[PDB]
Amino acid sequence: EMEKEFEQIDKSGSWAAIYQDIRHEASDFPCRVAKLPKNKNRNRYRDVSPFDHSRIKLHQEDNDYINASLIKMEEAQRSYILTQGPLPNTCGHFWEMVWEQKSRGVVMLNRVMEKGSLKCAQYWPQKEEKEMIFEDTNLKLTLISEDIKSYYTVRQLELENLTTQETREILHFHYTAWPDFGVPESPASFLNFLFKVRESGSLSPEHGPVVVHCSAGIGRSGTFCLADTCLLLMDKRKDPSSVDIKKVLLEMRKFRMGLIQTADQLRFSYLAVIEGAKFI
């Protein structure tokens, strides 16, 4: 019946009106740590900041700030870390967060170069023979393997703590099929990407929360978590028709501002949940 709500919004063309209502009802919490002049160079965009109450704190004593937010969906029993694409000076902060939060999976929803512009920094090794060292941290990153497919790429990474010589396996799920303009016309490849992340066990609570990021960490990143959470709800509820995508999105926006950036991404999220529910 969520399909019925989709057909009626499509018929009246009210996707922009629906999305604008979501923006009007969205939570507004302070972001004072992010707006400190010390953390300007740690933010990719001045209008995309984490809330104080939900920001991920680095275990570094001097400056614990990273543009990342913890999303807790209690009923769906899932947690995500949403962050921006690492900057050239925050690549060590990124992997420090992954280590400290004990994350198993890293979900990347953008290409490094989209339409002749740098949307993200190369924070993982391109060659298996050359490791990456992050000086400000105690971390060593090594590319073990990668499986390249037409819509996404899965890489096996080894994160080593040089202090204790402890190593962890990090799975890197890189979705590469998102168009430079607009949204995918079909959610088939995006859903197959999500189910691939699910099957790896990375979303399971015995691991730390997965790190999901795009360019700013709100747009495509919101669609991944919104779709994943909405699919979990209608599978564990007695009445799957009680799931409201708008309600779930507003609940999500309590933890990070601006999730789902355009009415086009909102329509795509509807299409992914509808097709995903049909796929079960």
Swiss-Prot record:
**Which reaction equations make up its catalytic activity?**
O-phospho-L-tyrosyl-[protein] + H2O = L-tyrosyl-[protein] + phosphate
Which residues does the record list as Cysteine sulfinic acid (-SO2H) (modified residue)? Answer: 214
* Active-site residues per Swiss-Prot or TrEMBL entry: 214
Q: Which residues carry this modification: Phosphotyrosine?
A: 19, 65
Query: Which positions hold the covalent cross-link N,N-(cysteine-1,S-diyl)serine (Cys-Ser)?
Result: 214-215
Q: Which family does it belong to?
A: Belongs to the protein-tyrosine phosphatase family. Non-receptor class 1 subfamily.
Protein name, UniProt field? Tyrosine-protein phosphatase non-receptor type 1
Tell me what organism the protein belongs to: Homo sapiens
